[PDB]
Design a protein around this ligand. Structure first.
Ligand SMILES: [Mg+2]
Ligand SMILES: [Mg+2]
Ligand SMILES: [Mg+2]
Ligand SMILES: [Mg+2]
Ligand SMILES: [Mg+2]
Ligand SMILES: [Mg+2]
Ligand SMILES: [Mg+2]
Ligand SMILES: [Mg+2]
Ligand SMILES: [Mg+2]
Ligand SMILES: [Mg+2]
Ligand SMILES: [Mg+2]
Ligand SMILES: [Mg+2]
Ligand SMILES: [Mg+2]
Ligand SMILES: [Mg+2]
Ligand SMILES: [Mg+2]
Ligand SMILES: [Mg+2]
Ligand SMILES: [Mg+2]
Ligand SMILES: [Mg+2]
Ligand SMILES: [Mg+2]
Ligand SMILES: [Mg+2]
Ligand SMILES: [Mg+2]
Ligand SMILES: [Mg+2]
Ligand SMILES: [Mg+2]
Ligand SMILES: [Mg+2]
Ligand SMILES: [Mg+2]
Ligand SMILES: [Mg+2]
Ligand SMILES: [Mg+2]
Ligand SMILES: [Mg+2]
Ligand SMILES: [Mg+2]
Ligand SMILES: [Mg+2]
Ligand SMILES: [Mg+2]
Ligand SMILES: [Mg+2]
Ligand SMILES: [Mg+2]
Ligand SMILES: [Mg+2]
Ligand SMILES: [Mg+2]
Ligand SMILES: [Mg+2]
Ligand SMILES: [Mg+2]
Ligand SMILES: [Mg+2]
Ligand SMILES: [Mg+2]
Ligand SMILES: [Mg+2]
Ligand SMILES: [Mg+2]
Ligand SMILES: [Mg+2]
Ligand SMILES: [Mg+2]
Ligand SMILES: [Mg+2]
Ligand SMILES: [Mg+2]
Ligand SMILES: [Mg+2]
Ligand SMILES: [Mg+2]
Ligand SMILES: [Mg+2]
Ligand SMILES: [Mg+2]
Ligand SMILES: [Mg+2]
Ligand SMILES: [Mg+2]
Ligand SMILES: [Mg+2]
Ligand SMILES: [Mg+2]
Ligand SMILES: [Mg+2]
Ligand SMILES: [Mg+2]
Ligand SMILES: [Mg+2]
Ligand SMILES: [Mg+2]
Ligand SMILES: [Mg+2]
Ligand SMILES: [Mg+2]
Ligand SMILES: [Mg+2]
Ligand SMILES: [Mg+2]
Ligand SMILES: [Mg+2]
Ligand SMILES: [Mg+2]
Ligand SMILES: [Mg+2]
Ligand SMILES: [Mg+2]
Ligand SMILES: [Mg+2]
Ligand SMILES: [Mg+2]
Ligand SMILES: [Mg+2]
Ligand SMILES: [Mg+2]
Ligand SMILES: [Mg+2]
Ligand SMILES: [Mg+2]
Ligand SMILES: [Mg+2]
Ligand SMILES: [Mg+2]
Ligand SMILES: [Mg+2]
Ligand SMILES: [Mg+2]
Ligand SMILES: [Mg+2]
Ligand SMILES: [Mg+2]
Ligand SMILES: [Mg+2]
Lengths: 113, 49, 154, 50, 138, 117, 101
RNA sequence: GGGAUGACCCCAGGCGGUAGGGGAGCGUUCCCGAUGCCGAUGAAGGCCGACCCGCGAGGGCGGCUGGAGGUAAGGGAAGUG
RNA sequence: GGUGGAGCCUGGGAGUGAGGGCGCGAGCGAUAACGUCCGCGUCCGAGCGCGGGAACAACCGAGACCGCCAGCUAAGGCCCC
RNA sequence: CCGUGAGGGAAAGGUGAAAAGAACCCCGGGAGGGGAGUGAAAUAGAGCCUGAAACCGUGGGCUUACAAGCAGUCACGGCCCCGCAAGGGGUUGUGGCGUGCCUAUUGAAGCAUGAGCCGGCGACUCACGGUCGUGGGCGAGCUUAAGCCGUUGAGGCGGAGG
């Protein structure tokens, strides 16, 4: 039995954060915890908040026994991007996209007979 | 100097191949000789230095 | 593009802007611009030769006659129109209302009896028309009508 | 006669040359105006009866 | 009726002397054997080949003035990068290689063509590596 | 009454991309590159059908020419055995004879090595 | 023990008990046609001439067919010319029963 | 030719094609058919299909989605690809 | 003689009115030009569809309705690729 | 909103039958989610009907580091799936073959124009005359215009005129 948590509409650019996500996929919860603390990215914080909310979700609502779980699946999707005007030389005016993530961590229990 | 510009849009293949090096390396950690917790070497453990 | 709300102004200079080339924005090539060659109010009436309208009236009756579907009648007595009363005279006349009927009479009260039946359409005799004959299985007239039907044609 | 079987004769509402529209109809692209110059142009020619 | 196609065959070896054979004359067959175009089951894509071994490679012989006149040429990358080697010089430098070249040229081009040439082992003078069978055509 | 595009263009464009499944890059993912890609595959497949017939015969021949070169002759001469030898029967399709049924083949060599000679 | 037979302008190698897909021909299904044409006996020395005479192979029409449809297409660049035509080539199926001398 | 007056079967011939001419069809929106018929036991639309019919444009059928519409044969008209 | 996608007549609809290469005959040119301008043919155009010519509109071969894992040939080829 | 001003001038509609619009609990600073609950349905949950395509991502099968290419195609083989089976679908190793689409040109893969990709919008009409043809009506004739009567979308009359 599995438990997941999704943070929707995070103001972070997916490419950036998908990076630390790949750093935890498949690892047990004990190291993934250790990995994000000492990982240096703005994305490391955010992924950790989802990671934890999913552990919390697991052990409470799903009766899953916190010491036996790993990160089964994790992935980040691209939520709606924020467009602001960027004034440019010679009256030019570009548009930068301040982008947005949907982070998903999914937890499952290590088989652990 | 005039104004170089990319001549073709990069294929999804050639950009993803570019990014073949971009993955990170998980930080390197030792078990803390005092506390239970994990810590990076040659450094003062965030719990009880 | 003539009647659409927008201005007559040239949208861009037309050279060196590096963009395509444009006039007013009522131009049909623009989203929200004018329509090309779309519909204007118009009159679809024409004039059939009157001799053709005579003939068609004849023909269409005849075809209903040739099927035996025609029935003439005298006088009803399902008059003083209330569709209760009509639905009797009608039943007696062998009209189930399994077949859509067109009823032609100059009698106001008989006419207004039938109107509401899902299977009946109804006319004064001057109202006679081949469209209404053909949509209807059986045709039924009184003699006051049938006469002028004849005095119509000829 | 029912409204179903009414219909016109085999000539009679010939209907109709519009293209325009695809390759394959023939009349594609140039739309039978055939490439060219002034005749192809929108108000085209100058009144040939004169 | 679908044409027969061979499943994996028995990779038969062969032996050739070359001494006094001409060259392109000798080479022609070496190709046909490398190919395996002489086997009734011949298949274009598979390479059911022969493994052709040649000895006494120093000892090939050729007509005309070719030992002096005939030039080999090698481009490197660089300006003035064309190198020109006359036949005889080659023979005293790396003998064979001349046959190796004559065959490689006569083999097809592409991934499979490149494989077959691997299957031609050419040695100078007598002897060789002794593994397989090798019936000798002369 | 107006008839706007609605569902027609979507469906057409789909017909085609379905055909384009498997193709590289945009050529499978984009209605234009799909359509252009297809024309190509269209004329190819056609032409390569004609060329398939050519392609096989040349295989048949090499096999024959090889096999009766064990029995010591030209393919060139072999066929002029059978022209005259009446064994105008064929082949060249079969060639499984040469492979699968050798002495059937051999016999055919013989019927062919004596032909008006 | 085989044969080599001729139908629809091709040669095919037939056996007793062989479902063989062949060029369409005139029979109603289930009927039998020996094809009076036979080119090679598979016991050898009967070979030769157009046809070894008196021989034939007995096979039974299992019914007719239409093969998987071929989409055959023509395109000519810069001339605004394309043609599509669908094609499925009719055939009849056979069981090769008996080799008759 | 056959006498079915064709639509069906045999025979024989033609069938590269741009400008362009002619000819048949398919599909879309709407009207008559319609106070009808299909429909929650599931409309339109969407997503699959290696299945059937069609030379093709297309039509079917099945499955999943969708949740209130749709609209035959046969004709008419266009903001119709 | 010749039944031909021949011919003639009246009418409806066009498109074209930038051609090019090659052969042969001339002119201009320099017994130059992938030059230019006419004549008679041809092909490309529109047959950048097929085979040969390494590759290649117009040179040689040949006029591609669809299918076949059948046969004879054309030009050009038959030492190997 | 843009323009000193005259003036220019948009985008932007849909939960559900009913708010019954998610008490309370858990993670969290909040956002967000997970349970519970409501509902016929909650990937109908308010960034709310349907929810296509380009686009981005996770998982799976086949494949790929001595090969060279308009990316396809034709053949054989290998691995994977579906079917008793002969058979079919996915994939691609090697082998044959192969100069993008449109447009303009005598001639284009062309190192000549246009197009980043996808979706929607986008161009031969209508009136009145004319001239051919065609389906019908009546035929030494044919035919009405304005208008007048009458009408559930009913038709008739009207002969000036042509
Ligand atoms: Mg700046
Ligand atoms: Mg400024
Ligand atoms: Mg940008
Ligand atoms: Mg400077
Ligand atoms: Mg620089
Ligand atoms: Mg205005
Ligand atoms: Mg305005
Ligand atoms: Mg205005
Ligand atoms: Mg205006
Ligand atoms: Mg102005
Ligand atoms: Mg630009
Ligand atoms: Mg607007
Ligand atoms: Mg508007
Ligand atoms: Mg045309
Ligand atoms: Mg036409
Ligand atoms: Mg025209
Ligand atoms: Mg043009
Ligand atoms: Mg011009
Ligand atoms: Mg003009
Ligand atoms: Mg449109
Ligand atoms: Mg051939
Ligand atoms: Mg081309
Ligand atoms: Mg051209
Ligand atoms: Mg024919
Ligand atoms: Mg032809
Ligand atoms: Mg044609
Ligand atoms: Mg509408
Ligand atoms: Mg019902
Ligand atoms: Mg609709
Ligand atoms: Mg559906
Ligand atoms: Mg449902
Ligand atoms: Mg339009
Ligand atoms: Mg003619
Ligand atoms: Mg004419
Ligand atoms: Mg001129
Ligand atoms: Mg000229
Ligand atoms: Mg000469
Ligand atoms: Mg010259
Ligand atoms: Mg010239
Ligand atoms: Mg000429
Ligand atoms: Mg031209
Ligand atoms: Mg020609
Ligand atoms: Mg070319
Ligand atoms: Mg060639
Ligand atoms: Mg060649
Ligand atoms: Mg050519
Ligand atoms: Mg050659
Ligand atoms: Mg202001
Ligand atoms: Mg509502
Ligand atoms: Mg909350
Ligand atoms: Mg419930
Ligand atoms: Mg939920
Ligand atoms: Mg849904
Ligand atoms: Mg819903
Ligand atoms: Mg949205
Ligand atoms: Mg609703
Ligand atoms: Mg939705
Ligand atoms: Mg999507
Ligand atoms: Mg993946
Ligand atoms: Mg190498
Ligand atoms: Mg490799
Ligand atoms: Mg290939
Ligand atoms: Mg263009
Ligand atoms: Mg131009
Ligand atoms: Mg030009
Ligand atoms: Mg030019
Ligand atoms: Mg270009
Ligand atoms: Mg280029
Ligand atoms: Mg230009
Ligand atoms: Mg252009
Ligand atoms: Mg550009
Ligand atoms: Mg742009
Ligand atoms: Mg579009
Ligand atoms: Mg008119
Ligand atoms: Mg007219
Ligand atoms: Mg007329
Ligand atoms: Mg008349
Ligand atoms: Mg009159």
């Amino acid at each position: 039995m599995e438990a997941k948590a999704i943070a929707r509409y995070v103001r972070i650019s997916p490419r950036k954060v998908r990076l630390v996500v790949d750093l935890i996929r498949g690892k047990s919860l004990e190291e993934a915890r250790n990995i994000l603390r000492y990982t240096n990215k703005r994305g490391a914080y955010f992924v950790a908040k989802v990671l934890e909310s999913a552990a919390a979700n697991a052990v409470n609502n799903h009766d899953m026994l916190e010491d036996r779980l790993y990160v089964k699946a994790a992935y980040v999707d691209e939520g709606p991007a924020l467009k602001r005007v960027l004034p440019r030389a010679r009256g030019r005016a570009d548009i930068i996209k301040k982008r947005t993530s949907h982070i998903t961590v999914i937890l499952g229990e290590k088989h652990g007979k | 100097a005039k104004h170089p510009v990319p001549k073709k849009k990069t294929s999804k293949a050639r950009r993803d191949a570019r990014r073949s090096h971009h993955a990170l390396t998980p930080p390197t950690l030792v078990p803390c000789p005092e506390c239970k917790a994990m810590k990076p070497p040659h450094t003062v453990c965030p719990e009880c230095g | 593009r003539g009647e659409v709300a927008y201005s007559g102004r040239k949208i861009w200079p037309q050279k060196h802007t590096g963009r395509a080339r444009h006039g007013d924005i009522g131009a049909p090539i623009f989203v929200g611009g004018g329509v090309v060659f779309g519909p204007k109010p118009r009159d679809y009436s024409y004039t059939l030769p009157k001799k053709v309208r005579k003939k068609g009236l004849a023909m269409a009756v005849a075809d209903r006659a040739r099927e035996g579907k025609l029935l003439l009648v005298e006088a009803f007595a399902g008059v003083n129109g209330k569709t209760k009363e009509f639905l009797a005279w009608a039943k007696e006349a062998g009209l189930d209302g399994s077949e859509s009927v067109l009823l032609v009479t100059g009698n106001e009260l008989v006419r207004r009896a039938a109107r509401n039946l899902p299977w009946v359409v109804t006319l004064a005799p001057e109202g006679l028309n081949v469209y209404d004959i053909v949509r209807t299985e059986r045709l039924v007239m009184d003699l006051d009508a049938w006469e002028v039907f004849q005095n119509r044609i000829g | 006669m029912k409204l179903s079987d009414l219909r016109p004769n085999p000539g009679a509402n010939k209907r109709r040359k519009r293209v325009g529209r695809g390759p394959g109809s023939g009349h594609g692209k140039t739309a039978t105006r055939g490439h060219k110059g002034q005749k192809s142009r929108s108000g085209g020619l100058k009144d040939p009866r004169r | 009726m679908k044409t027969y196609v061979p499943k994996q065959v028995e990779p038969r070896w062969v032996l050739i002397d070359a001494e006094g054979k001409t060259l392109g004359r000798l080479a022609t067959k070496i190709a046909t054997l490398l190919r395996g175009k002489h086997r009734p089951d011949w298949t274009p894509n598979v390479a059911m080949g022969d493994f052709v071994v040649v000895v006494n490679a120093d000892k090939i012989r050729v007509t005309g003035k070719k030992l002096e006149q005939k030039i080999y040429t090698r481009y490197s990358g660089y300006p003035g990068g064309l190198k020109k080697i006359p036949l005889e010089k080659m023979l005293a430098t790396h003998p064979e290689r001349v046959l190796e070249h004559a065959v490689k040229g006569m083999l097809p081009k592409g991934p499979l063509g490149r494989r077959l040439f691997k299957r031609l082992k050419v040695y100078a003078g007598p002897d060789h590596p002794h593994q397989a069978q090798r019936p000798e055509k002369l | 009454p107006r008839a706007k595009t609605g569902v027609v263009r979507r469906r057409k464009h789909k017909k085609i991309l379905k055909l384009a499944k498997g193709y590289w890059g945009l050529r499978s993912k984009s209605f234009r590159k799909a359509r252009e890609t297809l024309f190509a595959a269209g004329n190819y497949a056609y032409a390569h059908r004609k060329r398939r017939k050519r392609d096989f015969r040349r295989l048949w021949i090499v096999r024959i020419n090889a096999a009766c070169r064990q029995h010591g002759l030209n393919y060139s001469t072999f066929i002029h055995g059978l022209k005259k030898a009446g064994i105008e029967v064929d082949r060249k399709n079969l060639a499984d004879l040469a492979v699968r049924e050798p002495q059937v083949f051999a016999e055919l060599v013989e019927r062919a090595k004596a032909a008006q000679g | 023990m085989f044969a080599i037979v001729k139908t629809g302008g091709k040669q095919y190698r037939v056996e007793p008990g062989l479902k063989l897909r062949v060029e369409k021909l005139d029979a109603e299904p289930g009927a039998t046609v020996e094809l009076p044409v036979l080119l090679l006996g598979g016991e050898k020395t009967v070979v030769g001439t157009p046809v070894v005479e008196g021989a034939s192979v007995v096979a039974e029409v299992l019914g007719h067919g239409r093969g998987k449809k071929i989409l055959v297409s023509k395109f000519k660049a810069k001339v605004q010319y394309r043609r599509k035509k669908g094609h499925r080539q009719p055939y009849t199926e056979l069981l090769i029963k008996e080799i008759r001398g």
